[PDB]
Amino acid sequence: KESAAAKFERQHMDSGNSPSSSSNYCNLMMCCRKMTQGKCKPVNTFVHESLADVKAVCSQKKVTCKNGQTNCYQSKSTMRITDCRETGSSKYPNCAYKTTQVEKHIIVACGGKPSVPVHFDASV
Amino acid sequence: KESAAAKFERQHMDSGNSPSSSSNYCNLMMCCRKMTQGKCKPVNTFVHESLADVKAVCSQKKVTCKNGQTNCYQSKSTMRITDCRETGSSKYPNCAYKTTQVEKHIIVACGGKPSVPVHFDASV
Ligand SMILES: Nc1ccn([C@@H]2O[C@H](COP(=O)(O)O)[C@@H](O)[C@H]2O)c(=O)n1
Numbered sequence A, B: 001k002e003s004a005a006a007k008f009e010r011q012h013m014d015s016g017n018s019p020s021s022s023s024n025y026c027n028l029m030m031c032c033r034k035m036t037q038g039k040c041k042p043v044n045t046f047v048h049e050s051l052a053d054v055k056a057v058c059s060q061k062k063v064t065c066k067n068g069q070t071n072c073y074q075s076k077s078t079m080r081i082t083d084c085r086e087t088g089s090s091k092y093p094n095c096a097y098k099t100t101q102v103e104k105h106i107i108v109a110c111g112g113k114p115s116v117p118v119h120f121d122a123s124v
């Protein structure tokens, strides 16, 4: 059971960060979206275009998947995305990320019916 | 089980024009620090001062807690804090917060041995 002291630190303490930072985004979002539990997910991309635009990639250019499956698609246009990479200093449970704002084409794996993105493969 | 489509949205989608904006700090932090599960916590303060300074409040100005308990203390000096309050548009499970950076005195409840902050009572 979480201690009251620890609960206060969780709910109320942010000693180590600036609320006006633009580069703390990955640290917060990787935490928010549950990719820092058990271990730090080493690499993750967030896409800032509309969900409709991202879903539409599944109808765009067929390309090779990094894993050799044949269900990957590349966006016809570059998209606004954020690249999150673990830092050299990052050590679970203190997961630290470098945030990079990028405009690149995304490659996603699509699946399901309707065919929708199910995995983020690469940005190129 | 979380659907593949949902997993992609959780891991990879953050649609919007200014995702890393300082205005989004409360949205990200409230999510990361687990105050948006079940319902949106309406009001929450994050403190940007050293934990040493916040612990030191437990030996500062005694004040009655808002709820009538008698283990509250007010900081002698103001502290840099961020006030998170639900917007008029916020509705679970889409919690939305206005982020406001202010410098105010904090009032905390102190408990345990050693006596440390266990509850955030108010900012004044
Ligand atoms: N550019 C990249 C590369 C990988 N990833 C994420 O990392 C996961 C595994 O990637 P790797 O197989 O390349 O290590 C992918 O499913 C994806 O969620 C990403 O989000 N952006």
Ligand SMILES: Nc1ccn([C@@H]2O[C@H](COP(=O)(O)O)[C@@H](O)[C@H]2O)c(=O)n1
Pocket: A011, B043, B044, B045, B046, B066, B119, B120, B121, B122, B123
């Ligand atoms: N200024 C404030 C007011 C309330 N709160 C949080 O909201 C809870 C309830 O506050 P109220 O008593 O004002 O409704 C407190 O336990 C505290 O966690 C806060 O963090 N900062």
